[PDB]
Design a protein around this ligand. Structure first.
Ligand SMILES: NCc1ccc(C(F)(F)F)cc1
Ligand SMILES: NCc1ccc(C(F)(F)F)cc1
Length: 330
């Protein structure tokens, strides 16, 4: 079997992407944030503290004839940005673009942090990292991908994120019409539960390519590109007037500047991020200082190839017994 679903940016800056997902019987359609950096499928629900819901569509298990409460199971998650949520667990039927999984663990939020309440466009998250990171206790639960793997034509899913435009998540097949040239595959380490890989270097604009190993994770759930301080300093040094701002919390640049592209290495291949992808607009309404899409990972502890990098490529998440990541230009 296969599945295919359109994913859409939630705002004019591509801060995140939402994908419709059908849950329950009859279907309840929620718009979820597909997150290859986490492994929990959790949703706003009828059980969520009422004051913590502000426009989101909620899952109501009491209206699904296939929902079953998973007795005694709870979940609690904290994300690298300080957001958090928690609740109890149902099993139900979950479908993504024609691809159906029965008995998927659907984690019902009882409490959500403020950053989720204020995001009216995101009804929950669909985790696509490895199931070892799932937070359900006392019995760990599998991700949607792990549950679907056996019935997929190929144990893969692909991310084709758009720049200020819709894109596609495909499950079980690789669309050879969606990219140019060849796909370059690279090894993945699952030891931390992430889609962790090693980039072979970088270049700034038309500058010379620097061969150097950058270990990081492919994370559709993170907006920006977080790289080591040496790399990030080399990039912003090429933008007149750019500086690191402690009060803002990252590199900013004059909104009148033109940004250079950023190239990152995948084996012997190169993925080029256009400079426009790195502009995230004024730091406040009406400001002439703009926020940069490439930031330092120093305070994080790990390098993150987020949406800024991934949307410049066609990305294959190969969940075979030896997992790999594939990158192609598009
Ligand atoms: N998108 C999920 C996510 C968020 C943060 C991190 C961090 F901070 F631990 F790297 C990993 C995964
Ligand atoms: N990396 C997972 C994640 C995704 C979205 C959010 C937001 F946007 F709701 F804050 C937080 C954390």
């Amino acid at each position: 079997s296969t599945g295919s679903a359109t994913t859409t940016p939630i705002d004019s800056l591509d801060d995140a992407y939402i994908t419709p997902v059908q849950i329950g019987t009859p279907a309840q359609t929620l718009n979820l944030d597909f997150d290859t950096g986490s492994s929990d499928l959790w949703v706003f629900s009828s059980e969520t503290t009422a004051s913590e819901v502000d426009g989101q569509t909620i899952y109501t298990p009491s209206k699904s004839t296939t929902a079953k409460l998973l007795s005694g199971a709870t979940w609690s998650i904290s994300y690298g940005d300080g957001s958090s949520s928690s609740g109890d667990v149902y099993t139900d039927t979950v479908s993504v673009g024609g691809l159906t999984v029965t008995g998927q663990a659907v984690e019902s939020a009882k409490k959500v942090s403020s950053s989720f309440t204020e995001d009216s466009t995101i009804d929950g998250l669909l985790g696509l990292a490895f199931s070892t990171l799932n937070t359900v206790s006392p019995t760990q639960q599998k991700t949607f991908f792990d549950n679907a793997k056996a019935s997929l034509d190929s144990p893969v899913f692909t991310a084709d994120l758009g720049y200020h435009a819709p894109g596609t998540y495909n499950f079980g097949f690789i669309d050879t019409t969606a990219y140019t040239g060849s796909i370059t595959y690279t090894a993945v380490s699952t030891k931390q539960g992430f889609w962790e890989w090693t980039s072979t270097g970088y270049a700034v604009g038309s500058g010379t390519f620097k061969s150097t190993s950058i270990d990081g994770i492919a994370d559709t759930g993170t907006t920006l590109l977080y790289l080591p301080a040496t790399v990030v300093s080399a990039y912003w040094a090429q933008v007149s007037g750019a500086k690191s701002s402690s009060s803002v919390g990252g590199y900013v640049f004059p909104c009148s500047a033109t940004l250079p592209s950023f190239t990152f290495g995948v084996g012997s291949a190169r993925i080029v991020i256009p400079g426009d992808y790195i502009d995230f607009g004024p730091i406040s309404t009406g400001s002439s200082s703009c926020f940069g899409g490439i930031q330092s990972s120093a305070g994080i502890g790990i390098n993150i190839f987020g949406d800024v990098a991934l949307k410049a490529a066609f990305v294959v998440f190969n969940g075979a017994t030896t997992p790999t990541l594939g990158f192609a230009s598009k």
